[PDB]
Ligand binder design. Structure first.
Ligand SMILES: O=C([O-])CC(=O)C(=O)O
Ligand SMILES: O=C([O-])CC(=O)C(=O)O
Lengths: 434, 434
């Protein structure tokens, strides 16, 4: 395609830059490791290289240099609709370039050719007990499709070549990316919607087709597009992206890598923040404030009760971010436009005002501000996605855009297996002098 | 049980040591990161803490302070048989203590109660196409069983508590460890042995029962015990151990974590080294040396042809080890005793002599010596495990001993989510001065 040729051009430009850094600047130090960091999950260590996205603690996430407002600004929009083709965002992450309306249509056509789910994947999901958590089903659907890996075939057929490895990896990426929304939708329907299935519509973009298969009317299509774009990447240090990176560095294909990543995303400290926020808002509107939108004041002092009796406010606070998440802000902008009068949004809205002043007084948590998970669930809820456990599957579809693009580049640039060194407590104790 | 109480005692002893390092010595530097290392998969960075095992580049692996010859020396042996109870090695990795003959028998009894495979896992593996790679089937069998996670239940029921989290995680560990050999054997039989199944024998230890279900006679029982013990851990920096650690640090249960780890182990640069060795020995005996054990001399100069025409010797060279792997050596000791006259062993035997002098001349690769994978496959082959792809599944059963023990401790000591920081090539280029 044009995309594969274009991507080959970028790779040839980028390989010299990388080769130079290694040969001429390999011994330049860039960070140091303290004991607190080895025990505390490498927190803060500059140990990974990614170009797909960068998280500044302050401004937020940039995708290939662009801010979120810029990306939503410049990406080609869907005719009839407010939001960009998810396919265009994928182009941007792979190439670095904003695509023309013509280049987006080539990708969209390529996705349509590839979005059909194998029958055996459906058979597999049925064989798994229906009461299995949806993220388990999601990860197993991906895993099962490893049978179709082009990369695996390439390697196992003895044709592995340091230079052209990214090529099959890119095909696996196009294939897996085109099917994940269908997979997600199948799980939604089989678990939550009486196991009746709406077929994919070949005339629809990825986001439009997802809403279709989910059975949800406009503007859920736009909700979906936005959501997937917002959750598309957050550099390569987060557990899900880092896991895929790590697995793939052993030359496991994208099916293995992305299955592993979803095992990471299913963690309560990663993928469950969104539901645990909404539940807690719904529990609060019901109990403390009597099933009614509070006044600014009963909320203002309700936060103090939760806080100075020893409990977190969920969806405030992050292990890198120190400011408002602009992903949060973009949710807020959709919600002002589209659901100003929804009760649960109004409680999120007020929390934005009242909660940062109060987490500031305590000077306690290193991020006194909201992340995305504060705002995601209330939008889903409003459009009838009331099945909390499924929110993580949505996250998983979105995050694949960034992760799969990152895996292509990792193979493109020939990055080696990730193999750090371990140490014992005995060893750390010797170095401390004990 | 005794094991759970004993392990609670060790945890209470160990938490203070850890708490001290953090509060009193958190800023002590232990390493630095260069550009070479960020681009080259964190190679050499001391970034992980594990107490289960330590890999010295020179002496090799120690399990809880003991060398391999020590572990085989001191662990209680199976009556009738040359090798230790695998259950005892598990006790050692969890506790740090060599168990009495009486403590091994309690564990063995606890495994017997838990080793039955859920029906739905068999249903799942049947739904997956029978031509699926066995490691895909393995990882998905584990993943499917996440439905039974006690840890997940514990967390989701709102009972999470920093102090007692290891308790359900230990139950998941006992349950998953007890079933993995059954899972492996089911896959062997269903794929390779006409899908007829030998039932588990309640009178047999883990290693004996595996050989039983595999359908292989003595001394395969001892082959299995040894193999699982040798492959039980290799500190927490390797891709499979590191992946489970990483996933589990988000509080994903051991089913998710160990499933993700197997996605890593299936990588060619991790789990496929064992078959890629044997195939290459068999290809060589057949072509260059005419279907017959060479003399020392035709082999001696055959290595030079492969080497100075730009190709690796498989199963020589490792990303940490700088000497002979003592895991290799222990394979060699089994094989001298039990199969001195096997053709393929005789070629491995000679390679040990001839290949280190020659990789030394070149002073090229930082480990001019063998690892385990050089010796594993020939032993399997000799006993009729001729199905190459399955070797990695054996690895996977063995490695669980270390990894699952490591996950219990990670939760015991409350280790935080692994979230390092990413940087761009642009940023690395700024720091180099460009
Ligand atoms: O955790 C991170 O670094 C970013 C992210 O993906 C998340 O907020 O879940
Ligand atoms: O240490 C390594 O990278 C290889 C390994 O995991 C193992 O042999 O178990």
């Amino acid at each position: 395609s044009f995309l594969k040729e274009k991507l080959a051009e970028k790779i040839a430009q980028h390989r010299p830059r990388t080769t130079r850094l290694l040969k001429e600047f390999g011994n330049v130090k860039i960070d140091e490791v303290t004991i607190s960091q080895a025990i505390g999950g490498m927190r803060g260590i500059k140990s990974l290289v990614t170009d797909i996205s960068y998280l500044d603690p302050e401004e937020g996430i940039r995708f290939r240099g662009y801010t979120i407002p810029e990306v939503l600004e410049k990406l080609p929009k869907v005719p009839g609709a407010e939001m960009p083709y998810v396919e265009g965002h994928f182009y941007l992450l792979l190439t670095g370039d904003v695509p023309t309306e013509k280049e987006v249509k080539e990708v969209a056509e390529e996705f349509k050719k590839r979005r059909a789910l194998p029958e055996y994947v459906k058979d597999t999901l049925k064989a798994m007990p229906r009461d299995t958590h949806p993220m388990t089903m999601f990860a197993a659907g991906i895993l099962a499709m490893q049978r179709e890996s082009k990369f695996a075939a390439y390697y196992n057929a003895g044709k592995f070549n340091k230079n052209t490895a990214w090529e099959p990896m890119f095909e696996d990426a196009m294939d897996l990316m085109a099917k994940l929304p269908s997979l997600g939708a199948y799980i939604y329907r089989m678990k939550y919607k009486s196991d009746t299935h709406i077929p994919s519509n070949p005339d629809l973009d990825l986001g439009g087709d997802f809403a279709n298969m989910m059975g949800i009317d406009k503007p859920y299509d736009d909700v979906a597009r936005l959501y997937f774009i917002l959750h598309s990447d957050h550099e390569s240090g987060n557990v899900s992206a880092h896991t895929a990176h790590l697995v793939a560095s052993a030359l496991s294909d994208a099916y293995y890598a992305y299955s592993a990543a979803m095992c990471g995303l299913a963690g309560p400290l990663h993928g469950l923040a969104n539901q645990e926020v909404l539940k807690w808002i719904q529990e609060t509107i019901d109990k403390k404030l009597g099933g009614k939108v509070p006044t600014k004041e009963e909320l203002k002092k309700f936060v103090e009760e939760t806080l100075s009796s020893g409990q977190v406010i969920p969806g405030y606070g992050h292990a890198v971010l120190r400011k408002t998440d602009p992903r949060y802000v973009a949710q807020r902008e959709f919600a002002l436009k589209h659901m100003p009068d929804d009760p649960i949004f109004q409680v999120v809205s007020m929390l934005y005002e009242v909660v940062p002043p109060i987490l500031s007084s305590l000077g306690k948590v290193k991020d006194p501000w909201p992340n995305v998970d504060a705002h995601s669930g209330c939008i889903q809820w409003h459009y009838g996605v009331v099945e909390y456990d499924f929110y993580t599957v949505l996250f998983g579809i979105g995050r694949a855009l960034g992760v799969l693009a990152n895996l292509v580049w990792d193979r493109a640039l020939g990055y080696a297996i990730e193999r750090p060194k371990s140490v014992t407590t005995d060893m750390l104790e010797k170095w401390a002098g004990i």
